[PDB]
Amino acid sequence: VKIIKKPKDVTALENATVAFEVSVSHDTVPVKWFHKSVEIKPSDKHRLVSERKVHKLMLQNISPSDAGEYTAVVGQLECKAKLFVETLHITKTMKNIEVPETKTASFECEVSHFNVPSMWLKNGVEIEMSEKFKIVVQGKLHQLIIMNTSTEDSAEYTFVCGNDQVSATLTVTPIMITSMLKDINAEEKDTITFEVTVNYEGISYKWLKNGVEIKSTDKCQMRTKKLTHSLNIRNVHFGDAADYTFVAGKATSTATLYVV
């Protein structure tokens, strides 16, 4: 009896199902399979199937323990093939971030394979995605986005990949109002400007008049150069006299406009 087809090497992922097959010239021929010098038996992991001239060994839910050389013995005839078992792992680490308050922070890591489930932890606890936490997957790149950061977002963040994991820390830096609002004594019809300076660029802020948020009309313009924020109020009259507040993250500053 002659071997017509020999088994081929197989590369597969952990937990995948794989097979090896030999085919022979004659129908009634018994076959044994060996791994690590031991004869393979039917089990929850091993299935042996014959169809006339074709003999198959099937392995379910493979583990790294299953990798290596398998041998098919047909009489005195013996042929070998190898299983390589690939495992999920992290291929690039994450960098610690420091981010100003209110700005967006992002962690990224790369994994070994496509179609890995995203799994992100904050101080050991699974993060449920929300308007705050955005999870993105781009092929083998996994990204965690944390929007509108606060000091409460400062923590250790972990990405889990199979049995592999990688951690990095986020540090959220508070906004500081370096140059505060000063009171303004103006005459009717004057154009005035409240100005503040902060320590970071591109932060979120709000202006308030007596506590109610202002929107920039032709009457109240809000401008922003580098770190300087301004509230310009044109053609000032008595209804413009009030308390004005600049709010940025947890940083606040109030002053008064007086109109003669």
Residue numbers in the entry: 4 to 263
What text does the study give?
Evidence accumulated over the past two decades has identified titin as a main coordinator of cardiac muscle homeostasis, and its dysfunction through genetic mutation as an important factor in cardiomyopathy. For this, we examined the unique mSNP T2850I in the I-band domain of titin I10, as a paradigm of an alteration in a general component of the titin chain. Domain I10 does not support specific interactions or have any known specialized roles, so it does not constitute an a priori sensitive locus of the chain. In previous studies, we have shown that the T2580I mSNP destabilizes the affected immunoglobulin (Ig) domain in titin, I10, and speculated that this instability increases the vulnerability of titin to proteolysis in situ potentially leading to myocardial damage.
I19–I11 crystals were produced in (c) 0.1 M Tris HCl pH 8.5, 30% (w/v) PEG 4000, 0.2 M MgCl2; (d) 0.1 M Bis-Tris propane pH 8.5, 20% (w/v) PEG 3350, 0.2 M sodium acetate. A three-dimensional model from (c) was to 1.9 Å with Rfactor/Rfree = 19.28/22.83%; and from (d) to 1.53 Å with an Rfactor/Rfree = 16.15/19.65%. Three molecular copies were obtained in two space groups that agreed in showing I9–I11 in an extended conformation. In I9–I11, the component domains follow a regular arrangement, where domains display relative torsion angles of 45°–68° and are connected by short, two-residue sequences (TL and PI, respectively). In each Ig-pair, the domain interface is consistently formed by the A'B β-turn of the N-terminal domain slotting between the BC and FG loops of the C-terminal domain. Here, domains interact directly through a limited number of contacts (section S2). Both I9–I10 and I10–I11 interfaces consist of a central hydrophobic residue contributed by the linker sequence (TL; PI), flanked by two polar interactions between loop residues from the neighbouring domains (inset). In addition, electrostatic potential maps of single domains in the I9–I11 tandem revealed that the N- and C-terminal poles of all domains are, respectively, positively and negatively charged. This suggests that an electrostatic component further assists the organization of these Ig domains within the titin chain. Residue T2850 is buried within the I10–I11 interface (burial fraction of side chain is 0.79 as calculated with FoldX).
